[PDB]
Amino acid sequence: REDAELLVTVRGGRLRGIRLKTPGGPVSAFLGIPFAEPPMGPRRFLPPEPKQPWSGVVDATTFQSVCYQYVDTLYPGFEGTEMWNPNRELSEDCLYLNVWTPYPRPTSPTPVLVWIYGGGFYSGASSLDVYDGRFLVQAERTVLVSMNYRVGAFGFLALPGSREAPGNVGLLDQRLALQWVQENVAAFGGDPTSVTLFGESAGAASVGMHLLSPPSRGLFHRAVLQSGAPNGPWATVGMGEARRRATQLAHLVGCPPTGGNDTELVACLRTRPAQVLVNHEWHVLPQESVFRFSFVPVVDGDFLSDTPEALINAGDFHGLQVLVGVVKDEGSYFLVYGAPGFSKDNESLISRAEFLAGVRVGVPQVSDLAAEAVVLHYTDWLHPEDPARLREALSDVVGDHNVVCPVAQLAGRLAAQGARVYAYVFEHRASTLSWPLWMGVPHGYEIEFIFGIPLDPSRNYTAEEKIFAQRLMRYWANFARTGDPNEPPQWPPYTAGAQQYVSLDLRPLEVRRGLRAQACAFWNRFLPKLLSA
Amino acid sequence: EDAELLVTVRGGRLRGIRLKTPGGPVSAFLGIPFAEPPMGPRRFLPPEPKQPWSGVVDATTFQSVCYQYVDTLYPGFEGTEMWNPNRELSEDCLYLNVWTPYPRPTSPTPVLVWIYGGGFYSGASSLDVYDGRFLVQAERTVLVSMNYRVGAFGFLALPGSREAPGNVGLLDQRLALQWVQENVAAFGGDPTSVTLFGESAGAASVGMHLLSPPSRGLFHRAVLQSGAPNGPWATVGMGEARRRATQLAHLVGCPPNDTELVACLRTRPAQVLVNHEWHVLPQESVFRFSFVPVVDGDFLSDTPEALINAGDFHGLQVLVGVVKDEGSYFLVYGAPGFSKDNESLISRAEFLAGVRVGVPQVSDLAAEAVVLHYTDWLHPEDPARLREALSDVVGDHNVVCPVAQLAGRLAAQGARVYAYVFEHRASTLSWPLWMGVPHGYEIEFIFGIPLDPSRNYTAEEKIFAQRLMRYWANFARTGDPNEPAPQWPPYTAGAQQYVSLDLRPLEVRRGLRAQACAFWNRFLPKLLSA
Ligand SMILES: *[C@@H]1O[C@H](CO[C@@H]2O[C@@H](C)[C@@H](O)[C@@H](O)[C@@H]2O)[C@@H](O[C@@H]2O[C@H](CO)[C@@H](O)[C@H](O)[C@H]2NC(C)=O)[C@H](O)[C@H]1NC(C)=O
Ligand SMILES: *[C@@H]1O[C@H](CO[C@@H]2O[C@@H](C)[C@@H](O)[C@@H](O)[C@@H]2O)[C@@H](O[C@@H]2O[C@H](CO)[C@@H](O)[C@H](O)[C@H]2NC(C)=O)[C@H](O)[C@H]1NC(C)=O
Ligand SMILES: *[C@@H]1O[C@H](CO)[C@@H](O)[C@H](O)[C@H]1NC(C)=O
Ligand SMILES: *[C@@H]1O[C@H](CO)[C@@H](O)[C@H](O)[C@H]1NC(C)=O
Ligand SMILES: *[C@@H]1O[C@H](CO)[C@@H](O)[C@H](O)[C@H]1NC(C)=O
């Protein structure tokens, strides 16, 4: 007849899932659970509406559609970029979440990990093979939840102040899913009083925005931010710039036939095919750049009552445990997306002039004075034109500016203001990595080890990489359970003075000091004062 | 009487004195007048050539030191007293000294001309540490040194006025250079082989003579030790010069009309203007001086930095260098928390306060940039690192990076440049150990003072001194310090090679604090312009 472990009643109605095989045993998976009404037609750009109850049983047995998004075409067929591309059909009917739970379902409440994917707020989906939650659940006996949220114009196009495109609706998709977890995760055996958010890149920035937004802050208890932070120069935009990009996108697709009236302009935008909007999304950016995305969260006083930097500084974080970290070469992957002289298919040994040109691309919309401060800082004046040093230097520029230093400042302010902070640098380059060697450990390539993907026997990770994956899954699950990744070589907390972090590689833990303290002093302490004068 | 000590120069006859050195005798002619005494109505005016005299001028002892402030910070302490005047003050001070081998050379001998330092407010050619007898005996050159007016007497300027034109202490120097061309041959010197060298403000003066065409034709080579004309302290603009001259008049009871103002200033005793000199500076500071060369379009047709960037320097050889710890000396003169008696382990608040004293008259954003570059953000409050950092701030801003910029620009534009860092701390040094090798303490070795047996230098230090005198004299004779053994390579804008000078053989290194000097020479000028 039917398996009772694969049947669950949530508030909206009844669900049926699947028993998934893992190397270490079975898990229960509930894939493609609807948590909102489909944001289509007149509901495009609008905040999500809770899912209306249903009769009968909803088959939650496979991943649902990927939210409409740009699809990368830089290296067609190349595995390094195709692993991030959608592996389901694109659709605006895309607001579904997934729950993995042990089989049989836990008897006592189990801590919950909620995953938020990255993708620069223009791409991503919960269905990518690298986000498979079955290994974490099997190896560490937790409930894992992940959700889809709208991206690009559909998720973050803002006409601030209006009600037909209030902006930040992608973030409220995530908030609605977090509300779903609170009311429904106990039906799967999860503990709604022990919920850990974790995300990577734009997903990590999203996790931060949930810490800084009171309505979300009551929906979870711990946070993990990998290679991203809400105070990053890319993660938010101002109301005026949001309105300019939205208006310009509208103008490029023929609507209005030209700011005019907000409702009349959004109404014309809703008549355009989703693909049309996606095809003009990149044209709205003010300048040539890497690491800049058209539609991102807007600082509009609602979701974010101030900028994330202001709330990070004015924040009281007692009772909060946070885990933050970076990969070793955060900036290298992005240089092959527009920096002059860079390619994955050669060594990308650039000239001095290409370095100075790459600085303006990696640090866009700053004065010439600011740009020369960057060049001064990143130049080795005993070797000013060494191509190999120049390649590394520009990698450090975009990496420090966009990831490492925003995260270091978040870590320091939270530790100094009541939070327990743990920090890592991920330094293992996977044996299966398809990117060239000069890129080191690129952005986003720690995720597969945290989700335990090397345990998939149909993948050729070495045996030591599988023990490594098992090590980090324990760290993360220990953190989710207790707020401390150490087991009951130690991992010390991060503090504003000592600034201690650990390296995560095949070797045992190693404690170091300072997350590029010299470089981040420039980005977090000095250069803000330069832009204010 | 001895014929070797009788010399006739253009102005008349001179009698010198025979001196003893451990290597044998030298002849010396001290207190030779090269200008009319700049007294009374001649105060603040360009020097007038000395009128001819009858009889024989006594040139057997040093003459008066020009009127200057006397340091009273550590009274009786040798480390400061060795720089203080050692002859009576007087405005009648325009005299020069000639040292020569004994008996006087018969073949033309290369000439070294020494310009003393002292912030353009002090210094004298009679200091024990400038005694030319050892260089002249060891290396068989002719050595000349001159007094030049310092303080308001040499650099008070009301630009445009004929009463107080400015830069007259530089003109005193040039008149002595002219005197050398017309008279050094009467001592055996070769007027076609004149090497200028000076320390600190003396080095700044040398650089100014390079950049002033009427000066450039009076010498052939230059040595700049721990100074440069493009230093932030070395020149002043016309507006600030008039403001400082006006503030001085007011402080001495003189109505602050240019003719009346200088006339009133002329009536005041010299010591009165000395007493009020420091009080016209715009801010509390170390390393700033009230009356310095003014850029008025005459002696300097533009700022020293402009003329360095625009200059053709082919055919010029320069030797430039610094000591290891240029900044430590100056910290005990106004930096909070410092003393030659403490270990001067300052706090971060004292470090931040000291930044504004060692880098005066900069915007707050410029000060924050300095703090960014000189803080170690893994040890931001370590008192030993902070003491060391603000020493580097003062040294880099005021000495090392101006020297580095001049060396790089001169090398890239035709000059052959040799660069050194002096890294030997004298065994006899009285300053505390934490100050390292302080400003000014290479001069004793270059003048060969360790060979004086009346002093306690080691045997090693005596040999070291002889190696340095050989380098300096090789450079004077040929434009190359190397012996016609570890070689001293030219400094170039790209390789940036220099040598360390200590008891160990020569070691070639790269970069005169290239990271720090890109901040001061490349970035910060732009920050001031926006
Ligand atoms: C902006 O225009 C909207 C939309 O107006 C409607 O649609 C347009 C295409 C045009 O044909 C209008 O005449 C239509 O009324 C206005 O919203 C409407 O405003 C009226 C007046 O209060 C109200 O009765 C309708 O219900 C509104 N429709 C909505 C809210 O969907 C709006 O007033 C205009 N904004 C301004 C003038 O600031
Ligand atoms: C290293 O690669 C970059 C990128 O070039 C691309 O990839 C190469 C492997 C090759 O297939 C090129 O044709 C590709 O364009 C090179 O920079 C490019 O240089 C060409 C001129 O040769 C220029 O037209 C492109 O616009 C450049 N692209 C960028 C992004 O600047 C670089 O020259 C290569 N270095 C080598 C080959 O030594
Ligand atoms: C690892 O092993 C297979 C077996 O030949 C190899 O061809 C391939 O590189 C890897 N397999 C997969 C699925 O990536
Ligand atoms: C300035 O003094 C001179 C000197 O005698 C005098 O001729 C003149 O009257 C004074 N100033 C003027 C007229 O501005
Ligand atoms: C060292 O020489 C100095 C002269 O500077 C003299 O005062 C002193 O007595 C000598 N040393 C000793 C140990 O006396």
Side-chain angles (χ1 to χ4, degrees):
Chain A
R1 193 129 290 248
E2 203 137 49
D3 190 339
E5 295 291 341
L6 310 188
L7 306 165
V8 167
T9 305
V10 297
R11 322 262 270 251
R14 289 187 287 146
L15 306 167
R16 168 167 46 250
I18 63 169
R19 164 201 163 110
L20 268 177
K21 300 189 189 85
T22 81
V27 315
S28 305
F30 296 83
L31 312 190
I33 303 170
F35 69 90
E37 290 293 312
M40 331 188 57
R43 294 194 155 104
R44 188 189 272 175
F45 308 125
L46 286 194
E49 280 195 303
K51 206 293 177 294
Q52 284 302 119
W54 61 89
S55 59
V57 193
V58 156
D59 279 311
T61 60
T62 204
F63 286 124
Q64 256 281 4
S65 309
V66 170
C67 293
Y68 224 109
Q69 59 185 249
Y70 169 85
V71 174
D72 197 306
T73 57
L74 180 62
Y75 300 113
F78 176 60
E79 151 195 20
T81 57
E82 295 296 343
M83 57 172 299
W84 309 111
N85 276 326
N87 66 342
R88 286 304 204 273
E89 76 173 56
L90 300 189
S91 168
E92 314 196 43
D93 176 18
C94 67
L95 289 192
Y96 304 83
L97 52 83
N98 322 291
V99 176
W100 291 264
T101 199
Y103 187 111
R105 299 220 287 278
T107 37
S108 44
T110 309
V112 182
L113 275 163
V114 182
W115 170 253
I116 303 172
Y117 55 75
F121 296 107
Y122 68 90
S123 67
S126 70
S127 52
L128 299 182
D129 304 330
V130 79
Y131 301 153
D132 198 342
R134 83 180 72 194
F135 306 106
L136 252 171
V137 168
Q138 200 280 136
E140 290 293 321
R141 177 151 299 265
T142 46
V143 175
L144 186 93
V145 181
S146 77
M147 91 289 292
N148 274 10
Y149 62 89
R150 292 171 274 171
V151 295
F154 311 94
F156 298 100
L157 171 138
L159 287 175
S162 76
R163 71 183 241 251
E164 282 309 299
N168 294 332
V169 303
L171 284 171
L172 307 159
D173 300 341
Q174 310 174 4
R175 179 186 278 157
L176 185 45
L178 287 180
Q179 291 163 355
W180 188 97
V181 167
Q182 274 304 303
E183 320 180 355
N184 297 295
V185 80
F188 301 84
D191 195 352
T193 75
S194 175
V195 178
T196 296
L197 295 201
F198 76 123
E200 200 262 353
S201 188
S206 308
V207 168
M209 292 175 205
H210 289 295
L211 287 164
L212 311 177
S213 195
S216 297
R217 177 73 191 86
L219 306 176
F220 61 106
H221 312 83
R222 284 171 274 288
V224 174
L225 292 82
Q226 312 169 199
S227 304
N231 39 310
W234 50 273
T236 53
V237 86
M239 299 183 190
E241 181 61 11
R243 173 166 289 279
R244 190 199 58 77
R245 300 182 182 176
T247 299
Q248 161 88 315
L249 168 71
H251 178 269
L252 281 163
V253 307
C255 232
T258 292
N261 184 339
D262 267 346
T263 88
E264 173 255 339
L265 171 142
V266 158
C268 179
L269 271 186
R270 298 183 163 129
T271 72
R272 295 288 179 286
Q275 189 56 51
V276 156
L277 298 179
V278 170
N279 293 336
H280 297 90
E281 151 172 44
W282 293 99
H283 300 344
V284 311
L285 274 175
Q287 143 168 190
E288 169 133 0
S289 53
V290 295
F291 235 120
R292 292 290 183 289
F293 324 106
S294 288
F295 302 99
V296 298
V298 61
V299 185
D300 74 340
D302 192 4
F303 200 99
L304 309 163
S305 56
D306 203 334
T307 68
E309 309 78 329
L311 307 164
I312 283 158
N313 294 342
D316 178 13
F317 299 103
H318 281 95
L320 171 70
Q321 300 82 32
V322 172
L323 173 78
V324 308
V326 284
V327 304
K328 196 211 252 152
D329 301 272
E330 294 279 354
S332 60
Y333 166 67
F334 303 83
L335 302 166
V336 310
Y337 276 89
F342 279 82
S343 171
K344 81 169 193 67
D345 292 320
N346 70 26
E347 271 264 292
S348 292
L349 304 172
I350 58 175
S351 70
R352 180 81 183 165
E354 291 174 320
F355 171 72
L356 311 166
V359 169
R360 304 315 296 261
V361 152
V363 196
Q365 305 307 100
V366 299
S367 54
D368 314 325
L369 189 54
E372 278 281 69
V374 175
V375 165
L376 163 74
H377 222 270
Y378 285 84
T379 301
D380 184 338
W381 296 100
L382 287 180
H383 308 278
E385 321 208 359
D386 182 20
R389 281 178 172 96
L390 282 181
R391 185 192 53 199
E392 247 62 81
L394 176 68
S395 184
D396 283 331
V397 164
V398 309
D400 292 335
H401 175 51
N402 294 289
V403 175
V404 176
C405 291
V407 164
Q409 163 155 258
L410 163 83
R413 281 317 196 103
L414 298 213
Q417 294 163 208
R420 185 163 289 333
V421 180
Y422 299 90
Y424 69 86
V425 182
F426 181 88
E427 318 200 358
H428 175 75
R429 182 192 165 93
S431 65
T432 57
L433 197 35
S434 44
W435 290 101
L437 253 167
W438 64 261
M439 289 170 61
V441 184
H443 177 75
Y445 285 93
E446 89 281 23
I447 298 165
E448 51 202 86
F449 291 87
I450 295 169
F451 278 87
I453 272 45
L455 307 181
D456 190 333
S458 89
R459 298 190 198 261
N460 321 335
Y461 292 85
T462 78
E464 311 69 342
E465 284 175 316
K466 302 182 202 184
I467 287 93
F468 184 46
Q470 289 175 306
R471 269 185 62 215
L472 308 158
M473 293 194 293
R474 177 90 54 169
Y475 291 142
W476 263 239
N478 284 351
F479 177 77
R481 287 185 282 264
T482 81
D484 182 341
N486 293 286
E487 222 132 8
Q490 286 295 101
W491 182 340
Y494 183 95
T495 56
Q499 306 172 41
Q500 298 177 98
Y501 65 92
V502 303
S503 54
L504 301 176
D505 43 12
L506 308 185
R507 317 179 329 259
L509 280 197
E510 167 185 324
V511 178
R512 300 166 186 177
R513 290 193 56 238
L515 294 160
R516 294 190 53 82
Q518 285 310 289
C520 290
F522 165 79
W523 295 102
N524 297 327
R525 296 167 185 270
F526 173 65
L527 193 79
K529 293 163 187 177
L530 194 158
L531 301 164
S532 301
Chain B
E1 211 174 43
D2 193 353
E4 293 295 331
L5 310 165
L6 302 181
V7 172
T8 288
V9 292
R10 214 159 275 200
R13 297 182 295 152
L14 298 176
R15 182 186 289 112
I17 184 178
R18 185 169 37 77
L19 311 167
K20 295 168 28 162
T21 85
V26 315
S27 352
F29 303 82
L30 315 172
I32 308 171
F34 65 89
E36 287 304 310
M39 314 255 282
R42 278 176 165 145
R43 182 187 274 176
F44 309 124
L45 292 178
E48 203 65 4
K50 172 66 174 182
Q51 289 306 123
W53 61 87
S54 47
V56 183
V57 153
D58 186 335
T60 60
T61 182
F62 288 116
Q63 196 90 359
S64 300
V65 173
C66 298
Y67 251 111
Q68 60 190 249
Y69 172 86
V70 181
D71 191 34
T72 66
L73 173 150
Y74 294 142
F77 175 60
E78 155 204 319
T80 59
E81 295 291 2
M82 62 179 288
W83 311 110
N84 267 330
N86 67 338
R87 293 294 196 281
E88 71 167 50
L89 306 190
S90 174
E91 289 192 78
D92 180 10
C93 64
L94 293 187
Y95 301 78
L96 56 79
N97 319 291
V98 182
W99 289 263
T100 314
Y102 186 103
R104 305 210 312 264
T106 53
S107 324
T109 300
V111 178
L112 281 159
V113 180
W114 169 254
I115 313 192
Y116 57 70
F120 298 108
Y121 71 85
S122 68
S125 64
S126 49
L127 304 189
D128 296 339
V129 75
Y130 306 151
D131 198 334
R133 73 179 76 201
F134 304 99
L135 252 176
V136 167
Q137 191 286 321
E139 289 297 334
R140 296 194 62 76
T141 52
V142 168
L143 183 293
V144 179
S145 61
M146 93 282 287
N147 285 341
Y148 60 98
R149 288 171 281 173
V150 294
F153 308 94
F155 300 100
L156 188 131
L158 294 167
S161 80
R162 194 156 73 246
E163 300 300 0
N167 297 324
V168 305
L170 285 174
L171 300 179
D172 298 340
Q173 296 180 12
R174 161 185 300 168
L175 178 62
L177 289 185
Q178 287 165 4
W179 187 97
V180 168
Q181 286 297 307
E182 316 185 357
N183 304 272
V184 77
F187 303 88
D190 176 13
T192 74
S193 185
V194 176
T195 307
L196 284 192
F197 78 128
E199 208 257 353
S200 181
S205 293
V206 170
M208 273 161 219
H209 288 301
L210 280 164
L211 308 169
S212 188
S215 277
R216 189 58 192 93
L218 309 154
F219 64 104
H220 315 90
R221 278 170 290 266
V223 188
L224 292 74
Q225 315 169 201
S226 306
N230 43 309
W233 52 268
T235 51
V236 75
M238 282 180 302
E240 181 67 7
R242 171 174 295 280
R243 192 198 63 75
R244 298 175 181 195
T246 295
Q247 171 75 355
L248 184 75
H250 168 267
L251 291 165
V252 297
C254 278
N257 208 350
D258 280 356
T259 308
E260 294 178 338
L261 197 145
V262 196
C264 186
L265 282 167
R266 289 196 213 198
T267 70
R268 295 282 178 277
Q271 185 54 61
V272 168
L273 310 182
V274 173
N275 289 338
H276 291 100
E277 246 181 33
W278 289 104
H279 301 147
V280 317
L281 277 186
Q283 140 188 17
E284 295 312 338
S285 52
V286 63
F287 238 120
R288 288 298 182 279
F289 323 104
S290 302
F291 296 101
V292 299
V294 63
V295 171
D296 57 349
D298 193 358
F299 197 100
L300 295 166
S301 55
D302 199 334
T303 72
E305 198 205 7
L307 310 169
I308 288 157
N309 289 350
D312 188 344
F313 295 106
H314 286 91
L316 165 70
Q317 297 88 44
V318 307
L319 204 143
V320 316
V322 294
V323 298
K324 197 212 263 278
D325 305 280
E326 286 286 343
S328 68
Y329 180 87
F330 304 82
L331 289 179
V332 299
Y333 281 79
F338 281 86
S339 163
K340 93 166 171 66
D341 301 307
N342 286 343
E343 277 287 282
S344 291
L345 301 152
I346 57 173
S347 66
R348 176 125 188 123
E350 290 172 315
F351 169 83
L352 298 185
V355 175
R356 315 242 50 184
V357 180
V359 193
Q361 312 277 289
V362 309
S363 64
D364 304 311
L365 173 67
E368 308 260 331
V370 177
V371 188
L372 157 76
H373 194 91
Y374 284 85
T375 302
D376 186 322
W377 297 96
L378 288 178
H379 310 276
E381 310 222 341
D382 180 15
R385 280 178 175 100
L386 288 174
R387 180 190 66 196
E388 195 194 18
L390 174 88
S391 180
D392 279 334
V393 171
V394 182
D396 295 347
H397 171 51
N398 291 289
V399 183
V400 182
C401 293
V403 166
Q405 162 143 80
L406 169 121
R409 294 311 295 247
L410 262 42
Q413 303 169 198
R416 190 157 78 245
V417 182
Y418 300 83
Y420 66 85
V421 175
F422 185 85
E423 294 194 313
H424 174 75
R425 181 180 166 92
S427 63
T428 79
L429 193 33
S430 39
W431 293 99
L433 210 152
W434 67 260
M435 305 163 55
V437 196
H439 185 82
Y441 287 91
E442 87 284 20
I443 305 172
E444 37 197 282
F445 290 85
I446 293 164
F447 278 79
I449 309 303
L451 308 171
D452 193 345
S454 147
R455 326 221 182 202
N456 288 317
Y457 290 88
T458 83
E460 284 174 318
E461 288 176 314
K462 286 181 173 68
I463 302 162
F464 182 48
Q466 292 177 322
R467 197 157 48 91
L468 295 176
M469 291 189 301
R470 176 57 62 84
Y471 289 140
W472 260 240
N474 280 3
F475 176 81
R477 284 183 292 261
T478 70
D480 188 340
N482 295 280
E483 212 85 35
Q487 286 290 290
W488 183 339
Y491 179 93
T492 60
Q496 302 167 55
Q497 284 168 120
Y498 69 91
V499 300
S500 66
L501 295 175
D502 50 36
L503 308 174
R504 294 158 22 235
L506 288 196
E507 180 190 335
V508 183
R509 301 178 189 166
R510 288 197 61 217
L512 294 167
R513 300 193 50 73
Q515 288 312 301
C517 292
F519 169 69
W520 298 104
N521 293 336
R522 294 171 191 275
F523 174 62
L524 191 157
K526 295 175 194 168
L527 182 134
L528 298 185
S529 298

